[PDB]
Amino acid sequence: MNLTELKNTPVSELITLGENMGLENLARMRKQDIIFAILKQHAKSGEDIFGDGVLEILQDGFGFLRSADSSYLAGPDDIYVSPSQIRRFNLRTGDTISGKIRPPKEGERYFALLKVNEVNFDKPENNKILFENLTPLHANSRLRMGSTEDLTARVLDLASPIGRGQRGLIVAPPKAGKTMLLQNIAQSIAYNHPDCVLMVLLIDERPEEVTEMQRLVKGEVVASTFDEPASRHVQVAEMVIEKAKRLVEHKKDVIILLDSITRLARAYNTVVPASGKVLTGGVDANALHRPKRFFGAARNVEEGGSLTIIATALIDTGSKMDEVIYEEFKGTGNMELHLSRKIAEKRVFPAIDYNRSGTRKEELLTTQEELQKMWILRKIIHPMGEIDAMEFLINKLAMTKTNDDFFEMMK
């Protein structure tokens, strides 16, 4: 069987399989001791053990496979890759590895990976790295989004059209419905575009919210809580983007939605021993380089594939660190969507500033007929106040669909 499989087995059934297979009562033993014992009894016959994991290469050289459901956390069931195995196949961080593991020796609780069978869901010999892929304006295909929750999807597609490979910065003041808005986008994106793999990341997010994201966001949900150290927040972030980079190289569309790029930057600030040590806005100037790489990784590939990251920076938090990080991240993102607090005080759920919301290179993302519709919307909203414009666009969009809303407003 597969090692990842034995963990998915409930402990009650897993013992029953083991008892007939030559074990004693392992109810006393831990779940992992049951896993280790199972491999030990199967070592009687050739080619019995299999495994799956995501490659992570540590500083020293060697590496451990990481499970994505556990958020690439660390533990005793992770599989060891030799420094030769990595170089032999020229394996790269984020490569999905499916290899035969050998039974561990005695005294060593690390499972040795003997040979790898599949790399990136493909044969052992397989390309292009994202740093070498060509980068267009990433406005070639557009990501499209009656119910009450689609109202946010209707306004979002009209206010700031997201595209394949586009870096979205959704700036959110506190208590603006940031979490619900990202959730309504996440489920709707997966429905409209099943080809795109959703990879939501939560950084410095409360443990209450991670469970909701597990239940309502319909894709790989990797997260980091404040209960985990700052080194943990950065570790989960690089693993996800590096894996996403490997999938665009294999012409697979992946979309990632980050809950707090601002807090991700603070985590890099604490790991870097302040290289610059001169800009005194609370963050090390050269240290905000590493958060910028995360934001810079999102790119449409001409050669095939799409990486689109729509992250949310927090503003008006009262802490200079979060405000300084936003100001350095201003102008790097081509999508800008401001979640005004004042509108949220009026209890309309979208709480979007339509006048400040806009996308760069909207002409490649939008059809000329729709662009002509969008410009008309801008004409009424430029004089209109943002608090009262938003109420205007939801009651009328509740009665018809986007295109049909324009079909009856032609009088």
Add this chain to the structure above:
Amino acid sequence: MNLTELKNTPVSELITLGENMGLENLARMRKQDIIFAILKQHAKSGEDIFGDGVLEILQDGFGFLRSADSSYLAGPDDIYVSPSQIRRFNLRTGDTISGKIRPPKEGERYFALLKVNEVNFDKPENNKILFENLTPLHANSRLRMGSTEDLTARVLDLASPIGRGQRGLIVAPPKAGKTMLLQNIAQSIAYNHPDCVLMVLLIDERPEEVTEMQRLVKGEVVASTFDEPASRHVQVAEMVIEKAKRLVEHKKDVIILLDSITRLARAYNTVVPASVLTGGVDANALHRPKRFFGAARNVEEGGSLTIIATALIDTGSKMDEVIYEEFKGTGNMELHLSRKIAEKRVFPAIDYNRSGTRKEELLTTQEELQKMWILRKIIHPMGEIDAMEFLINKLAMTKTNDDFFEMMK
């Protein structure tokens, strides 16, 4: 035969090149090592292999011919220049050197240049440095700047005529078409003035547009993305100004277009910690960004170096506005972009009342100046949106000088 040529040749032919030269199994090898293996085995005879690059002499002395295709970046395609080569030809920062290279031997990991054939596109010892040659007001010859693209270019010649040696400061708020204007000037530069070599440089620009800019602008376009540290932004900038300085020393006019002098300044304050903050920026840090801008000068001894930089304003960070306030009054060119004008979807989006260049009298013929004064008088009472609407419907009926006859009717 030349390293730069093997860089441009596709990999499929490179496999045939190595196989015909006696090497085996070459498709598996990497792109640079396939180049290296071809170059290394070509060492059967001397004077066969060549290379090209722009000189960078680091704080220690070791010079490297960095390739311009990657925007003077670093990596294994760099050519090593010895500290001895420096004194022989008196090499200076920015010197473009094209010499025969030898492949490295064991114990050295970079390519060595044997002898230099051309220095600054001329003989090996063909000097006078830009730091002291005479500098007039730089208004002796004008860079003149019929289609939709000529409508955008026409207003600049009427509002603020760019000339040879002029320090350009065009203030551009966000979402005002800053990039579209910068490409339109660059496009107009190559056709009307191919004699001057155009060198648009982008600092802290997103990688999406860098590919756009290189394809639509017809010249070497060096840029640096924000995904790179602040030390990267300073390195690419120093190369451009010094390379431009050395080419003006050889009686060639060079024009460089900075997409954000503000972000170039943001890089310098963050890298320098020599030891006073006036608005969050270190005061002594603004000299080196000023050194970049101050280099644009017409030389009496021959040549003109034109830096037309674009300052960013009202970005929401007090820091970016402070860079403008200290660079205020240093720039000879003023072309003021406006957010409200671009928001009303009128295409040019220039503020004519405040847009103007100093010493228009040396730049313009006496016939043209009189048109300039009356046009200033007609639009000086007019507001901001109403000036451009005035200058776009009327410019649709005739081109450049012929507009004066439609205004005197």
